[PDB]
Amino acid sequence: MNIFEMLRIDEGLRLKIYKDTEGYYTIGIGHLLTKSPSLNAAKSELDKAIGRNCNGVITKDEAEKLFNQDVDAAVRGILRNAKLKPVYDSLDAVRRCAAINQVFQMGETGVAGFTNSLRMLQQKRWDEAAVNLAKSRWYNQTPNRAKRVITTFRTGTWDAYK
Numbered sequence: 001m002n003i004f005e006m007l008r009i010d011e012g013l014r015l016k017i018y019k020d021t022e023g024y025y026t027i028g029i030g031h032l033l034t035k036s037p038s039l040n041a042a043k044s045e046l047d048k049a050i051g052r053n054c055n056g057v058i059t060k061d062e063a064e065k066l067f068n069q070d071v072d073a074a075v076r077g078i079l080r081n082a083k084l085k086p087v088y089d090s091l092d093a094v095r096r097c098a099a100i101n102q103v104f105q106m107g108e109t110g111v112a113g114f115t116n117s118l119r120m121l122q123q124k125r126w127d128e129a130a131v132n133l134a135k136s137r138w139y140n141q142t143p144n145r146a147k148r149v150i151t152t153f154r155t156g157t158w159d160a161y162k
């Protein structure tokens with residue numbers, strides 16, 4: 001198991017513009033296109049990211065290219081964050097995948113407000129951080145996914161991904 005397969009399991013893969021769980025236009029492997037509700041805005045963003053007139057559809061290779069850049073941007077976002085960096089580096093390799101996942105899903109922003117969780121994770125209080133992480137909108141709106149990430153943080157193994 002690695003970050004890619006993990007994320008691929010959590011986000012799925014779609015080659016046509018779709019609405020995410022929050023109703024926003026997205027494509028590929030969880031690549032958000034825009035928060036605006038104009039489909040045309042979305043198609044525009046799509047062409048811009050892909051470099052060609054897509055007309056709302058892309059190929060698998062194109063989706064995977066987006067995915068790569070997006071994984072990369074997330075890590076890098078983590079590393080550049082002063083509140084994030086230190087926690088991230090204190091964790092083992094599996095748990096670091098759980099961190100990337102959350103970031104990928106919610107932005108460096110969203111995560112940066114999980115202050116108590118961050119601290120608990122940094123002190124390695126697994127069970128405590130798991131309970132704390134559950135007390136969030138994130139868990140409440142996408143519980144099945146959240147559960148898997150949480151378990152990952154809690155255990156440091158890929159069991160939830162089986």
Ligand SMILES: OCCc1ccc(F)cc1
Nearest residue numbers: 078084087088099114117
């Ligand atoms: O709860 C967020 C857990 C987390 C830890 C480190 C990091 F870089 C990003 C997210």
Ligand SMILES: [Cl-]
Nearest residue numbers: 048049050069
């Ligand atoms: Cl791009």
Ligand SMILES: [Cl-]
Nearest residue numbers: 142143144145
């Ligand atoms: Cl879910």
